[PDB]
Paper text:
The Eph (erythropoietin-producing hepatocyte) transmembrane receptor tyrosine kinase superfamily, with its first member identified years ago, contains 14 members in mammals and is the largest among all receptor tyrosine kinase families. In this study, we performed systematic biochemical and structural studies of the bindings of three SAM domains, two from previously identified Eph-binding proteins (SHIP2 and Odin) and one from a new Eph-binding protein discovered in this study (SAMD5), to the SAM domains from every Eph receptor. Our study reveals that the Eph SAM domains have exquisitely specific target SAM domain-binding properties, although their overall SAM-SAM heterodimer formation modes are very similar.
Similar to that of EphA2/SHIP2 or EphA6/Odin, EphA5 SAM also uses its End-Helix to interact with the Mid-Loop SAMD5 SAM. The most prominent difference is that the EphA5/SAMD5 SAM-SAM does not contain the π-π stacking observed in the EphA2/SHIP2 and EphA6/Odin complexes. Instead, the EphA5/SAMD5 SAM-SAM is essentially completely mediated by charge–charge and hydrogen bonding interactions. Similar to what we observed in the EphA2/SHIP2 and EphA6/Odin structures, Gly853A5 at the beginning of α5 in EphA5 SAM is also critical for its binding to SAMD5 SAM. The backbone amine of Gly853A5 forms a strong hydrogen bond with Tyr27SAMD5 sidechain hydroxyl group. Our crystal structure of the EphA5/SAMD5 complex can explain why SAMD5 does not bind to EphA1-4, EphA10, and EphB6.
Numbering used by the authors:
A (entry chain A): 804 to 872
B (entry chain B): 1 to 64
């Protein structure tokens, strides 16, 4: 909830390399990104397991902040 | 409140200098490290052949 764009969120978790890929494939606002699954990541070309973990862990961290707030 | 396990592991391999890059790339526990191959080392930035071989040999040992 505290990021202006998907690009800004990705750069905050050191995953900025995926920004273009997310925007081009239609995961283009913070709302679109919250429904992303591990399979969605795989189909977007995020095949490195550590990067999948980074991204899925952050998506979950952001959900936790929202349910708790 | 407890040492990061990937730091501890790389210390045991006498390659502690990569620990922060491992963790920053999401290789933050031994379950993830078990899946490491050449693309993962490339992204992390482990380039010296001896170090690459040492980590991949270690990864093989985690999968036993």
């Amino acid at each position: 909830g505290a990021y202006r764009s998907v690009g800004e969120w990705l750069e905050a978790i050191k995953m900025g390399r995926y920004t273009e890929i997310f925007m081009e494939n239609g995961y283009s606002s913070m709302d679109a990104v919250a429904q992303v699954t591990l399979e969605d990541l795989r189909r977007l070309g995020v095949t490195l397991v550590g990067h999948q973990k980074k991204i899925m862990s952050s998506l979950q961290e952001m959900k936790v902040q929202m349910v708790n707030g | 409140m407890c040492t990061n396990i990937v730091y501890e592991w790389l210390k045991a391999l006498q390659l502690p200098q990569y620990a922060e890059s491992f963790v920053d790339n999401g290789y933050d526990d031994l379950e993830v490290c078990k899946q490491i191959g050449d693309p993962d080392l490339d992204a992390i930035g482990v380039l010296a052949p001896a170090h690459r071989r040492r980590i991949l040999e270690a990864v093989h040992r985690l999968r036993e």
